[PDB]
DNA sequence: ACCAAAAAAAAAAATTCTCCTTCGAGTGCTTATCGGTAA
DNA sequence: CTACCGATAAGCACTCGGATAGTAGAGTTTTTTTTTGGTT
RNA sequence: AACUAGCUCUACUAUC
């Protein structure tokens, strides 16, 4: 019910003036904030303080503390996130990066 | 990572390192030990797959004397492109220096003998270290062959094999 | 010593060479790199198992450019250098402190101090000469040396054994 | 001229994700250094000329593999130790 | 803030909507897996009308004199009469219809017939129309057990989750029942008939070109959509000038709540 | 655990090639056939390498096999020409 | 070509790992023990003493050394020194934490206060997610400030067996600022039994304690043994960071440019020297202390400049001395305006103006711009003929070139170009040339609002520099043609030109999916115009439906 | 013999109030503390 | 009667603050002394 | 073809 309401305060704020927008945009934007047990809104520490990748985490609002919390933790990251290729400077698996592109052998003896 | 040593400086007895692990993982996935033959098992083998090469080089050409063997590796990379591949004949020169039996028969015979008795080939393939058939000399130079069993136990077993073969 | 055990190597291809040929190129270039290889680990690679049948299944392109990386699983013949172990060997090069034993692929170093005292060797001043037990001079000239320190430094193989301890030296 | 937070984002949305590497790599740092796996850091000595890459301390002559990343980045990382806190590896660990 | 809040989320190739740690947040993207492009604000006709309206316009019965349609319409549109299959058929999709009617009374307490919806089916109606040269006067050749079956036929190819067992079954039909139910609403007998006149080889064109629209209407797997939406509803936040709050103060207040309202006023009924 | 991968049956994913995929494909043969990489569709004195690429694609002989993943970390693959480019 | 070629294999980097750094590890992979806190002119010549500023560690300039790795100075990475401290200190940022730690410890025995006898421990052993345990340990643990030996009486039927270490009782610890001390009331052999003892606590003790502290408690308390054990909070042998990150600026007449971080090192040198020679000699015990506060302030300092304001660490000028944290902190430091968003190469900027004849997708683009931005190819059979054209005009002609790169490394000036009618392009090879049409480019207009405001364009070569474009792409960049701007990129590679011809085409962007609506349109002078056109009461005359018809580039041909 | 440049060595550092000053925002984390309550 | 929470508030302690551009202007230790070499 | 521009500190502007 909360998301519902949440969907329906937003959805007339934004309606109020220069509408509109389609509902996907903020059906996803409400749920992927309360999907979480309850609800959290986007602070520096609202969302921020959630178990994700270090990286992504440190480039908002917190700079090198974070990264403190992380090394005494000793926890690690598998940069799946975009920005850990960004950070890493490689390509993140994004858009045309979202899947590999591999060969094969039989196709060019079939077609010389 | 902490440094993960997990070694050891190896010895006469050959204690074995991580990295030989004794017990190796496969691609298929199966457990199986150190694959290891004696000096006489391996040259068998090289002559297989030095002959499959043989049909392999003849399919590409319609595109016991051990020199004459060593030519015939040659002959085998020249056919592909002109052979440098030196440091294959010198270790090759001591191929069949490996080899405790010189003449493939004998060292053959030995290997059809020893594959039903499934001895463990470490204690064969210390034989052909030096040239020299008494036992004595190994036992002065390797204790742990005196410490698993006495040696006449190893002569009551070598025997059965020491016979059909000739020493360099 | 001799292990024979299936090796995993990663290989690149150029791009120019993408033709129906290029598994037979795949598999000569092999033969190349792994053919006469001298690793750390490994000792001296000294030739490859069942030439035919080794898997190529597919490869990656790179995302820079054109160039396709391959990984290959093979069977391969490979020789390990132990310590511990006495080899006999050819005495190729001769130096006045010690004689120096090339024992086919690795090489022996030995000094006078190492040399034993039970077979008393006139190796201090130049190559121990025929004496007590048994010593030669040749370029042949095997003689009976231990290995005790392996260093992989180079892209080779190199041993040294002391020789004054129980039955070591030539005879 | 500078590229900025939302141009990033604008390209994310996009999802020219190689168009992106291109440009913040080749029109920028654009380095290469080598790692020891085994240190996971940022330490390795290499003496081109002699082909070799040893990393003291770690005495592993084959633990060895050179990265491409933004300067900026390493040296980030240079002061991140220096602040003392980074390990790095080069395939999974979990499955 | 909003637009470094969502950057990872994105559509994967199951359909889903995962983090960059696997939290699925959509099980469909949109709950329709529509691509945002491929939709138009076309009208739904099914809730409006009266019962009577709504009777005239879909009811039929060869039996019955009343809603019976002149048999001048179809080339075997006298004989047609009297068969028990056809108007076991054609109850079946009259009861199919109302259950569909009671549906969307329930979706909908307003009852607003213009909706946001993927490919549209007016605009191939009208250019299949001129495509053929359809006259007003010839008869139709197309039967009613063509259509009859054609329209379920169609209905059950259009896919959208490429799945073998029963949940994703349960969600294929799930995901596309406003879509479906609208296209029997557009596509029925009396409608077909009356007004559109087709004929079978048109009918087969126009069933052709649907199922293509809907394929290529899918929302294409591997784009990040939730980036796209942070800046989407982040654009218009600036492009606006201004007794109860409202404005960007108000949007910052939700956005970041914030326990402390200042209009907190509920309303009763 | 098993083998993180799938047989060619039973494949879940969608069959139409997707844009992402198109312009990736597009762009690394265009890089291929850049640098003198050889070529299979016959050309028509056609110069741009991007233009030929995209002929190829058209003509259909193109020796390439598209990996795919799925968040689980198990993957799967696909062969250019099963698939089928309407986008 | 090859970078000054390795040949190591490379590998994308797949997962990183967070952790402290080990004393003795961080000690075995320095190279410098640094004693001297003078940094050049030994005596006071040149070559810098071997005390900082590389004794063997990254070069200076043009002295190839690398530490003797003779790897140049855009080769070298760099390599690190350590330093040595007499007496352990603390870590600003390892502070709340290490409080926490000690509570939750009891010292004196090194043990745990709750040990599993009790639920309520035993729940927050349960909840593993990673760290919310420690929260629950912590809150748990702040009671029961004596140490007990035999706690499990009720578990048990009557009965209690022995578990603690010590039978002591954990004073109450307060901190101040760099400092934190312990409060031992204790309601016995204290001050009147109730007037508690005020000792500040010595590190090293707390660092002795943490040694104590078994290893399956550290996982207890979320340390990861190989990576993050508490003893290694504490600070003993500091790191030295390379030259590269402390550069010597020379700012511009003939200064040295020293870093602030230098100074700052210099000076905790200076410290470590005097508190050792302090120490060494009669230690009066009442200024040691100080010397180890100094030592401990200045490290503190330089780990960060901003902890709570009752210092400022002020430099020998007056400004502030920069720190670590100030220098990467956020909002253009080192990561938003150095990491995450950087400037580009192969870019340009200028004001605009409109274009009632370019078609939409293309960019009017100033010819001597054009000239000065480039692009690469690479030699084909194909395009030979082209390119040996352009590489025969030279750099100052629209269809010309800039740089010729052969198989190796070898960059070719054409300014110079002391052979210009010479060279022939063999195969393989690399050629930058100018931008001739048609060619695919980046335009944007910050700031960035949605998926627009940043497309590809097609390109078309105007004099009058300035650029050019279409009416109707106007309102999507929300940009006028008063005096504003955009920016231009262009790619660098095939890959990547392509990338863009079929995801920023200003063809694929005439919908816009935030509005399920199209953002394009036509504007106001044509809008006007026609609407003055398709009324009834209008005609035409037969001269100008003709010329119409012309107009039209579609024209079928039929009247 | 005069002295002037300059390099080297050390510290100017006190007046005083809390005004710092408007940055106020919120939010989270610590700590006092009445206040009740079951044994 | 008595610790035993305990919820409440008060405090106190946090760190945050649009995207680019282009300028030009002033100062990036001070003072004091001692030393010794240029000077007549 | 001898290979480097270059830091911070406040004021003013330019679009939005
Ligand atoms: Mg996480
Ligand atoms: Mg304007
Ligand atoms: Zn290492
Ligand atoms: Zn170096
Ligand atoms: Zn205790």
């Not at chain 1, 309360?34 to 440190?58: E, K, Y």
């Not at chain 7, 690398?66 to 760099?78: H, I, K, R, S, V």
């Not at chain 7, 683009?365 to 590489?391: C, G, H």
């Given at each position: 019910?909360?998301?519902?309401?949440?969907?329906?305060?937003?959805?007339?704020?934004?309606?109020?003036?220069?509408?509109?927008?389609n509902?996907?945009?903020?059906?996803?934007?409400?749920?992927?904030?309360?999907?979480?047990?309850?609800?959290?809104?986007?602070?520096?520490?609202?969302?921020?303080?959630?178990?994700?990748?270090?990286?992504?985490?440190?480039s908002?609002?917190?700079?090198?503390?974070?990264?403190?919390?992380?090394?005494?933790?000793?926890?690690?990251?598998?940069?799946?996130?975009?920005?850990?290729?960004?950070?890493?400077?490689?390509?993140?698996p994004?858009?045309?990066?979202?899947?590999?592109?591999?060969?094969?052998?039989?196709?060019?003896?079939?077609?010389? | 990572?902490?440094?993960?040593?997990?070694?050891?400086?190896?010895?006469?007895?050959?204690?074995?390192?991580?990295?030989?692990?004794?017990?190796?993982?496969?691609?298929?996935?199966?457990?199986?030990?150190?694959?290891?033959?004696?000096?006489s098992?391996?040259?068998?083998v090289?002559?297989?797959a030095?002959?499959?090469?043989?049909?392999?080089?003849?399919?590409?050409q319609?595109?016991?004397?051990?020199?004459?063997?060593?030519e015939?590796?040659?002959?085998?990379?020249?056919?592909?492109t002109?052979?440098?591949?030196?440091?294959?004949?010198?270790?090759?020169?001591?191929?069949?220096?490996?080899?405790?039996?010189?003449?493939?028969?004998?060292?053959?015979?030995?290997?059809?003998?020893?594959?039903?008795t499934?001895?463990?080939?470490?204690?064969?393939?210390?034989?052909?270290?030096?040239?020299?058939?008494?036992?004595?000399?190994?036992?002065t130079?390797?204790?742990?062959?005196?410490?698993?069993?006495?040696?006449?136990?190893?002569?009551?077993?070598?025997?059965?094999?020491?016979?059909?073969?000739?020493?360099? | 010593?001799?292990?024979?055990?299936?090796?995993?190597?990663?290989?690149?291809?150029?791009?120019?060479?993408?033709?129906?040929?290029?598994?037979?190129?795949?598999?000569?270039?092999?033969?190349?790199?792994?053919?006469?290889?001298?690793?750390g680990?490994?000792?001296?690679?000294?030739?490859?198992?069942?030439?035919?049948?080794?898997?190529?299944?597919?490869?990656?392109?790179?995302?820079?450019?054109?160039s396709?990386?391959?990984?290959?699983?093979?069977?391969?013949?490979?020789?390990?250098?132990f310590?511990?172990?006495?080899?006999?060997?050819?005495?190729?090069?001769?130096?006045?402190?010690?004689?120096?034993?090339?024992?086919?692929?690795?090489?022996?170093?030995?000094?006078?101090?190492?040399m034993?005292?039970?077979?008393?060797?006139?190796?201090g001043?130049?190559?121990?000469?025929?004496?007590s037990?048994?010593?030669?001079?040749?370029?042949?000239?095997?003689?009976?040396?231990?290995?005790?320190?392996?260093?992989?430094?180079?892209?080779?193989?190199?041993?040294?054994?002391?020789?004054?301890?129980?039955?070591?030296?030539?005879? | 001229?500078?590229?900025?937070?939302?141009?990033?984002?604008?390209?994310?949305?996009?999802?020219?994700?190689?168009?992106?590497?291109?440009?913040?790599?080749?029109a920028?740092?654009?380095?290469?250094?080598?790692?020891?796996?085994?240190?996971?850091?940022?330490?390795?000595?290499?003496?081109?000329?002699?082909?070799?890459?040893?990393?003291?301390?770690?005495?592993?002559?084959?633990?060895?593999?050179?990265?491409?990343?933004?300067?900026?980045?390493?040296?980030?990382?240079?002061e991140?130790?220096?602040?003392?806190?980074?390990?790095?590896?080069?395939?999974?660990?979990?499955? | 803030?909003?637009?470094?809040?969502?950057?990872?989320?994105?559509?994967?190739?199951?359909?889903?909507?995962?983090?960059?740690?696997?939290?699925?947040?959509?099980?469909?993207?949109?709950?329709?897996?529509?691509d945002?492009?491929?939709?138009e604000?076309?009208?739904?006709?099914?809730?409006?009308?009266?019962?009577?309206?709504?009777?005239?316009?879909?009811?039929?019965?060869?039996?019955n004199?009343?809603?019976?349609?002149?048999?001048?319409?179809?080339?075997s549109?006298?004989?047609?009469?009297?068969?028990?299959?056809?108007?076991?058929l054609?109850?079946?999709?009259?009861?199919?219809?109302?259950?569909?009617?009671?549906?969307?009374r329930?979706?909908?307490?307003?009852?607003?017939?213009?909706?946001?919806?993927?490919?549209?089916?007016?605009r191939?109606?009208?250019?299949?129309?001129?495509?053929?040269?359809?006259?007003?006067?010839?008869p139709?050749?197309?039967?009613?057990?063509?259509?009859?079956?054609?329209?379920?036929?169609?209905?059950?190819?259009?896919?959208?989750?490429?799945?073998?067992?029963?949940?994703?079954?349960?969600?294929?039909?799930d995901?596309?029942?406003?879509?479906?139910?609208?296209?029997?609403?557009?596509?029925?007998?009396?409608?077909?008939?009356?007004?559109?006149?087709?004929?079978?080889?048109?009918?087969?064109?126009?069933?052709?070109?649907?199922?293509?629209?809907?394929?290529?209407?899918?929302?294409?797997?591997?784009?990040?959509?939730?980036?796209?939406?942070?800046?989407?509803?982040?654009?218009?936040?600036?492009?606006?000038?201004?007794?109860?709050?409202?404005?960007?103060?108000?949007?910052?207040?939700?956005?970041?709540?914030?326990?402390?309202?200042?209009?907190?006023?509920?309303?009763?009924? | 655990?098993?083998?993180?991968?799938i047989?060619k049956?039973?494949?879940?994913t969608?069959?139409?090639?997707?844009?992402?995929?198109?312009?990736?494909?597009?762009?690394?043969?265009?890089?291929?056939?850049?640098?003198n990489?050889?070529?299979?569709?016959?050309?028509?004195?056609?110069?741009?390498?991007?233009?030929?690429?995209?002929?190829?694609?058209?003509?259909?002989?193109?020796?390439?096999?598209?990996?795919?993943?799925?968040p689980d970390?198990?993957?799967?693959?696909?062969?250019?020409?099963?698939?089928?480019?309407?986008? | 070509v090859?970078?000054?070629?390795?040949?190591?294999?490379?590998?994308?980097?797949?997962?990183?790992?967070?952790?402290?750094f080990?004393?003795?590890?961080?000690?075995?992979?320095?190279?410098?023990?640094?004693?001297?806190?003078?940094t050049?002119?030994?005596?006071?010549?040149?070559?810098?003493?071997?005390?900082?500023?590389?004794?063997?560690?990254?070069?200076?300039?043009?002295?190839?050394?690398?530490?003797?790795?003779?790897?140049?100075?855009?080769?070298?990475?760099?390599?690190?020194?350590?330093?040595?401290?007499?007496?352990?200190?603390?870590?600003?940022?390892?502070?709340?934490?290490?409080?926490?730690?000690?509570?939750?410890?009891?010292?004196?025995?090194?043990?745990?206060?709750?040990?599993?006898?009790?639920?309520?421990?035993?729940?927050?052993?349960?909840?593993?997610?990673?760290?919310?345990?420690?929260?629950?340990?912590?809150?748990?643990?702040?009671?029961?400030?004596?140490?007990?030996?035999?706690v499990?009486?009720?578990?048990?039927?009557?009965q209690?067996?022995?578990?603690?270490?010590?039978?002591?009782?954990?004073?109450?610890?307060?901190?101040?600022?760099?400092?934190?001390?312990?409060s031992?009331?204790?309601?016995?052999?204290?001050?009147?039994?109730?007037?508690?003892?005020?000792?500040?606590?010595?590190?090293?003790?707390?660092?002795?304690?943490?040694?104590?502290?078994?290893?399956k408690?550290?996982?207890?308390?979320?340390?990861?043994?190989?990576?993050?054990?508490?003893?290694?909070?504490?600070?003993?042998?500091?790191?030295?960071?390379?030259?590269?990150?402390?550069?010597?600026?020379?700012?511009?007449?003939?200064?040295?440019?020293?870093?602030?971080?230098?100074?700052?090192?210099?000076?905790?040198?200076?410290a470590?020297?005097?508190?050792?020679?302090?120490?060494?000699?009669?230690?009066?015990?009442?200024?040691?202390e100080?010397?180890?506060?100094?030592?401990?302030?200045?490290?503190?300092?330089?780990?960060?400049?901003?902890?709570?304001?009752?210092?400022?660490?002020?430099?020998?000028?007056?400004?502030?001395?920069?720190?670590?944290?100030?220098?990467?902190?956020?909002?253009?430091?080192?990561?938003?305006?150095?990491?995450?968003?950087?400037?580009v190469?192969?870019?340009?900027?200028?004001?605009?103006?409109?274009?009632?004849?370019?078609?939409?997708?293309?960019?009017?683009?100033?010819?001597?711009?054009?000239?000065?931005?480039?692009?690469?190819?690479?030699?084909?059979?194909?395009?030979?003929?082209?390119?040996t054209?352009?590489?025969?005009?030279?750099?100052?002609?629209?269809?010309?070139?800039?740089?010729?790169?052969?198989?190796?490394?070898?960059?070719?000036?054409?300014?110079?170009?002391?052979?210009?009618?010479?060279?022939?392009?063999?195969?393989?090879?690399?050629?930058?040339?100018?931008?001739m049409?048609?060619?695919?480019?980046?335009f944007?207009?910050?700031?960035?609002?949605?998926?627009?405001?940043?497309?590809?364009?097609?390109?078309?070569?105007?004099?009058?520099?300035?650029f050019?474009?279409?009416?109707?792409?106007?309102?999507?960049?929300?940009?006028?043609?008063?005096?504003?701007?955009?920016?231009?990129?262009?790619?660098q590679?095939?890959?990547?030109?392509?990338?863009?011809?079929?995801?920023?085409?200003?063809?694929?962007?005439?919908?816009?999916?935030?509005?399920?609506?199209?953002?394009?349109?036509?504007?106001?002078?044509?809008?006007?115009?026609?609407?003055?056109?398709?009324?009834?009461?209008?005609?035409?005359?037969?001269?100008?439906?003709?010329?119409?018809?012309?107009?039209?580039?579609?024209?079928?041909?039929?009247?």
């Amino acid at each position: 019910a909360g998301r519902a309401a949440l969907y329906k305060e937003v959805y007339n704020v934004i309606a109020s003036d220069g509408s509109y927008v389609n509902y996907r945009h903020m059906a996803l934007l409400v749920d992927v904030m309360t999907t979480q047990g309850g609800l959290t809104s986007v602070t520096r520490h609202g969302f921020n303080r959630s178990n994700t990748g270090a990286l992504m985490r440190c480039s908002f609002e917190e700079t090198v503390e974070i990264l403190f919390e992380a090394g005494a933790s000793a926890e690690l990251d598998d940069c799946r996130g975009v920005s850990e290729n960004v950070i890493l400077g490689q390509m993140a698996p994004i858009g045309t990066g979202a899947f590999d592109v591999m060969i094969d052998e039989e196709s060019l003896v079939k077609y010389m | 990572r902490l440094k993960k040593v997990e070694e050891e400086e190896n010895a006469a007895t050959l204690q074995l390192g991580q990295e030989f692990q004794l017990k190796q993982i496969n691609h298929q996935g199966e457990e199986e030990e150190l694959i290891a033959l004696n000096l006489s098992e391996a040259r068998l083998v090289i002559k297989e797959a030095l002959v499959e090469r043989r049909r392999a080089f003849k399919r590409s050409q319609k595109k016991e004397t051990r020199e004459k063997e060593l030519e015939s590796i040659d002959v085998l990379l020249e056919q592909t492109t002109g052979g440098n591949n030196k440091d294959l004949k010198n270790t090759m020169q001591y191929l069949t220096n490996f080899s405790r039996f010189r003449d493939q028969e004998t060292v053959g015979a030995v290997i059809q003998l020893l594959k039903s008795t499934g001895l463990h080939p470490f204690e064969v393939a210390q034989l052909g270290s030096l040239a020299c058939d008494t036992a004595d000399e190994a036992k002065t130079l390797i204790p742990s062959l005196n410490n698993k069993i006495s040696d006449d136990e190893l002569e009551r077993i070598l025997k059965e094999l020491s016979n059909l073969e000739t020493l360099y | 010593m001799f292990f024979i055990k299936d090796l995993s190597l990663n290989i690149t291809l150029h791009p120019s060479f993408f033709g129906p040929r290029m598994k037979q190129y795949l598999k000569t270039k092999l033969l190349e790199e792994v053919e006469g290889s001298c690793t750390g680990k490994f000792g001296y690679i000294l030739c490859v198992l069942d030439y035919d049948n080794i898997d190529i299944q597919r490869g990656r392109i790179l995302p820079t450019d054109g160039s396709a990386e391959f990984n290959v699983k093979y069977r391969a013949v490979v020789f390990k250098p132990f310590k511990g172990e006495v080899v006999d060997g050819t005495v190729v090069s001769c130096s006045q402190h010690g004689f120096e034993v090339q024992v086919g692929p690795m090489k022996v170093f030995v000094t006078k101090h190492l040399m034993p005292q039970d077979l008393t060797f006139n190796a201090g001043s130049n190559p121990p000469s025929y004496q007590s037990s048994e010593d030669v001079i040749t370029i042949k000239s095997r003689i009976r040396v231990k290995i005790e320190g392996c260093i992989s430094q180079v892209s080779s193989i190199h041993a040294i054994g002391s020789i004054k301890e129980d039955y070591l030296g030539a005879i | 001229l500078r590229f900025g937070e939302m141009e990033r984002d604008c390209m994310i949305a996009h999802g020219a994700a190689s168009f992106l590497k291109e440009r913040l790599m080749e029109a920028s740092d654009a380095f290469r250094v080598h790692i020891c796996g085994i240190c996971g850091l940022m330490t390795v000595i290499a003496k081109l000329n002699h082909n070799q890459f040893e990393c003291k301390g770690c005495d592993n002559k084959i633990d060895i593999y050179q990265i491409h990343i933004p300067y900026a980045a390493k040296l980030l990382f240079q002061e991140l130790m220096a602040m003392n806190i980074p390990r790095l590896y080069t395939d999974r660990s979990r499955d | 803030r909003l637009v470094k809040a969502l950057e990872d989320i994105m559509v994967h190739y199951d359909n889903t909507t995962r983090n960059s740690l696997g939290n699925v947040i959509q099980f469909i993207y949109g709950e329709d897996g529509m691509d945002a492009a491929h939709i138009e604000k076309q009208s739904l006709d099914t809730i409006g009308g009266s019962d009577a309206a709504f009777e005239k316009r879909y009811r039929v019965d060869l039996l019955n004199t009343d809603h019976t349609l002149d048999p001048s319409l179809l080339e075997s549109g006298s004989e047609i009469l009297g068969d028990l299959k056809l108007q076991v058929l054609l109850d079946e999709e009259y009861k199919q219809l109302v259950k569909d009617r009671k549906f969307l009374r329930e979706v909908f307490v307003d009852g607003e017939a213009n909706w946001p919806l993927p490919v549209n089916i007016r605009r191939i109606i009208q250019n299949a129309q001129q495509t053929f040269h359809i006259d007003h006067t010839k008869p139709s050749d197309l039967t009613i057990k063509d259509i009859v079956l054609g329209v379920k036929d169609l209905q059950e190819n259009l896919l959208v989750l490429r799945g073998k067992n029963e949940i994703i079954q349960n969600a294929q039909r799930d995901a596309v029942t406003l879509f479906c139910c609208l296209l029997r609403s557009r596509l029925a007998t009396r409608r077909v008939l009356q007004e559109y006149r087709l004929t079978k080889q048109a009918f087969d064109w126009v069933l052709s070109n649907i199922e293509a629209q809907f394929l290529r209407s899918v929302v294409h797997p591997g784009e990040m959509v939730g980036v796209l939406a942070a800046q989407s509803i982040g654009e218009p936040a600036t492009q606006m000038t201004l007794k109860v709050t409202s404005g960007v103060p108000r949007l910052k207040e939700i956005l970041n709540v914030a326990k402390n309202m200042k209009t907190p006023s509920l309303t009763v009924y | 655990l098993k083998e993180k991968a799938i047989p060619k049956d039973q494949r879940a994913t969608t069959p139409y090639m997707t844009k992402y995929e198109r312009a990736r494909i597009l762009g690394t043969r265009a890089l291929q056939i850049s640098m003198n990489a050889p070529v299979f569709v016959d050309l028509e004195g056609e110069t741009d390498p991007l233009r030929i690429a995209m002929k190829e694609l058209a003509e259909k002989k193109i020796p390439l096999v598209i990996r795919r993943y799925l968040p689980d970390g198990s993957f799967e693959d696909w062969s250019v020409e099963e698939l089928i480019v309407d986008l | 070509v090859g970078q000054q070629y390795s040949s190591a294999p490379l590998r994308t980097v797949k997962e990183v790992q967070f952790g402290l750094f080990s004393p003795e590890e961080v000690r075995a992979i320095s190279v410098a023990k640094i004693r001297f806190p003078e940094t050049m002119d030994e005596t006071q010549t040149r070559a810098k003493i071997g005390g900082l500023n590389d004794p063997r560690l990254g070069s200076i300039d043009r002295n190839l050394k690398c530490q003797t790795c003779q790897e140049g100075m855009n080769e070298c990475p760099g390599h690190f020194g350590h330093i040595d401290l007499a007496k352990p200190v603390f870590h600003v940022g390892f502070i709340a934490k290490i409080k926490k730690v000690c509570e939750c410890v009891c010292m004196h025995c090194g043990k745990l206060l709750l040990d599993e006898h009790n639920e309520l421990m035993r729940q927050a052993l349960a909840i593993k997610d990673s760290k919310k345990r420690f929260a629950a340990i912590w809150t748990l643990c702040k009671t029961k400030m004596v140490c007990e030996t035999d706690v499990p009486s009720e578990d048990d039927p009557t009965q209690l067996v022995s578990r603690g270490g010590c039978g002591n009782t954990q004073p109450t610890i307060r901190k101040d600022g760099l400092k934190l001390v312990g409060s031992w009331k204790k309601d016995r052999a204290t001050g009147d039994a109730d007037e508690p003892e005020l000792r500040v606590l010595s590190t090293e003790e707390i660092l002795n304690i943490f040694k104590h502290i078994s290893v399956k408690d550290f996982t207890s308390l979320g340390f990861n043994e190989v990576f993050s054990r508490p003893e290694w909070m504490i600070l003993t042998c500091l790191p030295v960071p390379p030259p590269p990150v402390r550069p010597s600026i020379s700012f511009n007449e003939s200064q040295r440019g020293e870093d602030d971080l230098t100074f700052k090192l210099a000076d905790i040198l200076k410290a470590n020297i005097s508190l050792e020679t302090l120490e060494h000699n009669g230690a009066p015990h009442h200024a040691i202390e100080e010397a180890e506060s100094l030592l401990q302030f200045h490290v503190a300092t330089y780990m960060d400049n901003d902890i709570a304001g009752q210092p400022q660490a002020l430099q020998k000028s007056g400004r502030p001395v920069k720190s670590i944290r100030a220098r990467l902190k956020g909002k253009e430091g080192r990561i938003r305006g150095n990491l995450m968003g950087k400037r580009v190469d192969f870019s340009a900027r200028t004001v605009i103006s409109g274009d009632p004849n370019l078609e939409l997708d293309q960019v009017g683009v100033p010819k001597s711009i054009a000239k000065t931005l480039t692009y690469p190819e690479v030699v084909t059979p194909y395009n030979i003929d082209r390119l040996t054209q352009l590489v025969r005009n030279g750099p100052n002609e629209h269809p010309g070139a800039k740089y010729v790169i052969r198989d190796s490394g070898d960059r070719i000036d054409l300014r110079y170009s002391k052979r210009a009618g010479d060279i022939q392009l063999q195969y393989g090879w690399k050629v930058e040339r100018h931008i001739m049409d048609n060619d695919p480019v980046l335009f944007n207009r910050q700031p960035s609002l949605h998926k627009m405001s940043m497309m590809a364009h097609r390109v078309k070569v105007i004099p009058y520099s300035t650029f050019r474009l279409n009416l109707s792409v106007t309102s999507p960049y929300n940009a006028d043609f008063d005096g504003d701007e955009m920016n231009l990129h262009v790619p660098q590679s095939e890959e990547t030109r392509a990338e863009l011809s079929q995801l920023c085409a200003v063809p694929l962007q005439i919908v816009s999916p935030q509005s399920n609506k199209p953002c394009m349109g036509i504007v106001q002078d044509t809008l006007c115009g026609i609407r003055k056109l398709t009324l009834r009461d209008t005609f035409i005359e037969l001269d100008q439906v003709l010329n119409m018809l012309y107009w039209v580039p579609d024209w079928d041909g039929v009247i």
